[PDB]
Design an enzyme around this catalytic site. Sequence first.
Site, mmCIF file in Angstrom:
data_model
loop_
_atom_site.group_PDB
_atom_site.id
_atom_site.type_symbol
_atom_site.label_atom_id
_atom_site.label_comp_id
_atom_site.label_asym_id
_atom_site.label_seq_id
_atom_site.Cartn_x
_atom_site.Cartn_y
_atom_site.Cartn_z
ATOM 1 C CB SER A 237 68.268 34.463 66.257
ATOM 2 O OG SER A 237 66.858 34.316 66.323
ATOM 3 C CB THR B 239 66.558 33.456 72.428
ATOM 4 O OG1 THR B 239 67.317 33.797 71.268
ATOM 5 C CG2 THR B 239 67.498 33.172 73.594
ATOM 6 N N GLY B 240 63.741 33.559 71.519
ATOM 7 C CA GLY B 240 62.893 34.299 70.616
ATOM 8 C C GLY B 240 62.549 35.650 71.211
ATOM 9 C CB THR B 241 63.556 38.850 71.150
ATOM 10 O OG1 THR B 241 64.339 38.114 72.105
ATOM 11 C CG2 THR B 241 63.222 40.221 71.722
ATOM 12 C CB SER C 278 63.726 33.790 66.785
ATOM 13 O OG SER C 278 63.735 34.919 65.953
ATOM 14 C CD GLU D 5 62.140 35.965 61.953
ATOM 15 O OE1 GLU D 5 61.140 36.538 62.436
ATOM 16 O OE2 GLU D 5 63.182 35.733 62.610
#
Lengths: 265, 265, 265, 265
Positions: free
Chosen positions: D100, D209-211, D42, D140
């Site tokens: 996000s 953030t990104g996960t 993300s 996504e």
Amino acid sequence: DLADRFAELERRYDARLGVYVPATGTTAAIEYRADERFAFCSTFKAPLVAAVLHQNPLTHLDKLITYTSDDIRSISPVAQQHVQTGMTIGQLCDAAIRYSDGTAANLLLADLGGPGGGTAAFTGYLRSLGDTVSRLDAEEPELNRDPPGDERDTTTPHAIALVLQQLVLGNALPPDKRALLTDWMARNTTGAKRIRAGFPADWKVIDKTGTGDYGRANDIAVVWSPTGVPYVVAVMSDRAGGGYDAEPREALLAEAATCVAGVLA
Amino acid sequence: DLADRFAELERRYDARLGVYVPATGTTAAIEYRADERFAFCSTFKAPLVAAVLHQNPLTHLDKLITYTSDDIRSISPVAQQHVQTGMTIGQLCDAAIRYSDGTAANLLLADLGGPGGGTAAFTGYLRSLGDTVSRLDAEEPELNRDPPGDERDTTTPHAIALVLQQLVLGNALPPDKRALLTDWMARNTTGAKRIRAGFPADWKVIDKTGTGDYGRANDIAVVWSPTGVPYVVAVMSDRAGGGYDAEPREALLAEAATCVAGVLA
Amino acid sequence: DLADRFAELERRYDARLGVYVPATGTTAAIEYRADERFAFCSTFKAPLVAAVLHQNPLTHLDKLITYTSDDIRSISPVAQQHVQTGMTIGQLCDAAIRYSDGTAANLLLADLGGPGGGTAAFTGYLRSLGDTVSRLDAEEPELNRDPPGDERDTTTPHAIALVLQQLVLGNALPPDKRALLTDWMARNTTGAKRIRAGFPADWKVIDKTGTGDYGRANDIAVVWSPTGVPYVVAVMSDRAGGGYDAEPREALLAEAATCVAGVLA
Amino acid sequence: DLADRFAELERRYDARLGVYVPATGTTAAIEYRADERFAFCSTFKAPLVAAVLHQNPLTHLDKLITYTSDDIRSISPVAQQHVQTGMTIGQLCDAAIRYSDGTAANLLLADLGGPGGGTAAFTGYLRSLGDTVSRLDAEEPELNRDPPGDERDTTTPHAIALVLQQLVLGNALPPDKRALLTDWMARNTTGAKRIRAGFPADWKVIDKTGTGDYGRANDIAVVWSPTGVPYVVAVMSDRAGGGYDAEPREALLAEAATCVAGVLA
């Protein structure tokens, strides 16, 4: 008194409001339109998970379920990502509680079996807890769009609250399964601006929301006072007459929840 | 009818509770022991900064103020660390509000000048705002331990709320200085368990606390509803019958803040 | 190379820096000017409380001590408020740790007895922990004002860290009295801008600061990593070149603590 | 020598770690696996908002965008609550950054228009800022679960940091649009346990953030030292060998961030 304020909130948000808080040993029961029917919407997903929990052993949560793209009919944030993998019953429980996943709800209904894809089985499970009033008649997403006045797919604040009380605070499930239900509701992600937004932050809030057409917005919750006393708060609302396309008003449920908090303090 | 619940809280915390919330264009004023005297304690530090701001141009905030170890007569979390460096007037303003610094308050009083090290100038400043009731007669820390019944260093919730309303919401200060007072109150570090803890988190709370002997705990605040309506909340309490050494009960003020919050919603 | 940054920090703040972190089972010992003498300043008040704790039963904490205005010599935020009533030994312990109360320290020295008002008894106590280097020779506030190069009233990071390690993490006190020491340091109010400001918030920090002339600023601390691993961190500094009136630089200690946190992570 | 600790953390967490901090006027560039590809996840939502801001005048933000239940194919905490209402372009930017929101990102891509639903237009925008490596190929949620080794949907720490440097600190956007991106990143709600947790609280941290799968956890940030110097911090990680179901380890990113802060102090 307090019922005069809920009316004010009904006028200021142009909604019919329903609020029920069960009576405790220390407080009287809060009632406002408590025994009038409001549409379940997604709040049934809380009594839907416990039912799967009730008649099935813990290993049934590891059972994998496969499904196709045609099965995705309602808002399904989790189910859309696992059409290739499939999801287990425990993952479907998480998704139905913590994201209000419509497709996980329809799959868990099918796990209860019976006529109507599990609606008869689920309503039958409510009956076992003393609830003779609510009923589930359709699946997702048709259960969100019944016309006002239609008794199908409806509960009442009074009924949904007493059900939720036995599930979270009562003994409807053994502590083994009971902590799974509560922990899913505690880490809910859909209800930040409803009952949780109306209570002070040092009150602990677990909830299960519901939203639908005709401006339907619900929130069922268990709250804990800062000293640890638990209360059950059932808040439901719609705006029939504003039409099928009426926009739901989350601020009404948050305002009414601060109203409740003032009485319980 | 809100007075039925406040009195119940007085009984439960062994305290005398005082609450005043000014009337707005649409809602009536909440009063409970509103015109009874409670000891100021540290809440006077909020109109004290406003008085200094009132009597001086903004560049007066850069004036460096030196003091000695003998000037540290009370809890002074910031002033204690800058006895070699000194502090500017604006730095004393910051500490007197955000950390309830005792020595900063005494120095700011001395900056107002006049008889009694500034107590007369501060009390006169209240008079100029219409406050015919309050009085400040001693400095820190003697003002926190007047015996119960003594009128010295006392205000009333009614009087302190109206003073705070003109400072933050009225025009007792020009907009540039008014935003300095508001921001210091917004970043207070002593009031997390009082009015701030009784209001939902989506309500903005700026406050100034006060604490002293005989279980004295106060909190004065301006709050903003999620829709942006401002209300002033003055909450005062002591437990004088419990003696000089009685512990203040912060939860009493948080609960009173939750009862008030239910009414303003 | 960690020694290059400490030297960097020395030039940027015009200070001499001393850092010692004892070696653990997992980390190497951090040293920078570890065995050079710095002035105790108020850091001796942490081992001073342990000395009172060591020789005396817990009931000794309830002993009331009376004192006069002539007895107030140094920064004494708490002692000034109880000149009429007096303070018990336990209150003097609280006041000496959490507020660095100079007068309470002088009374606790007198409680240790001996020549020079307890300085002989106090260093004797340090010796019982293996500390043959440190020494206390004066009372407050003269112990803060010794010329640079004078060995009186001095410790070293290496010595004060190993002492503090036996007191908080070791077995120098029984667990009951040891929890009293640790709690007072844990709720300290004078150290927010020193070691505590250089470590992430999920690190637990208990500390005792020291400040004096010649720009003397110290902080001795026990820190806990987010996983619960404890480390002892001794940070001392002065600016003997800037003169007697040199301003202490707290940000130096906060910056130096961030270098340590980077190595322990 | 910072590479030895980064190594030990790779071993400690069974993860591959990527770190880049651009060089400033006084400090050298920190690199660890700086030019290896890690999955965007993300983190691309921050330059995506910058792309929309770049190509449209500020009034374009008020354009209302409608979507169906079929458009929710990933975790969308805000888009899920407005399927009946619709959301404006600015609301999607808020939701895409601060929560996000996957659907807000997919719509914002669609607002960029062009081949591939905007992925080719987004990659082209990165190219215009000097980014020669990154690529966005899916939307996504498919972009999170490319197999290890697949170059699709990847950037590098070196590359993502320089893009972020130009957006917040450089001149890629005018001040009015740049302060919009900055404020959204400053009030992010998903990154408390990553870079923000490794830095002291007096450091200002804005991040995105990104996960994703294979234990992929990233965090890109601009941080401000207490004296106001800004640094850009790119931290990326995966655990690809542990499989598609490998759990991301947020503590690795906080620990790596504490190592970085020790060097920037």
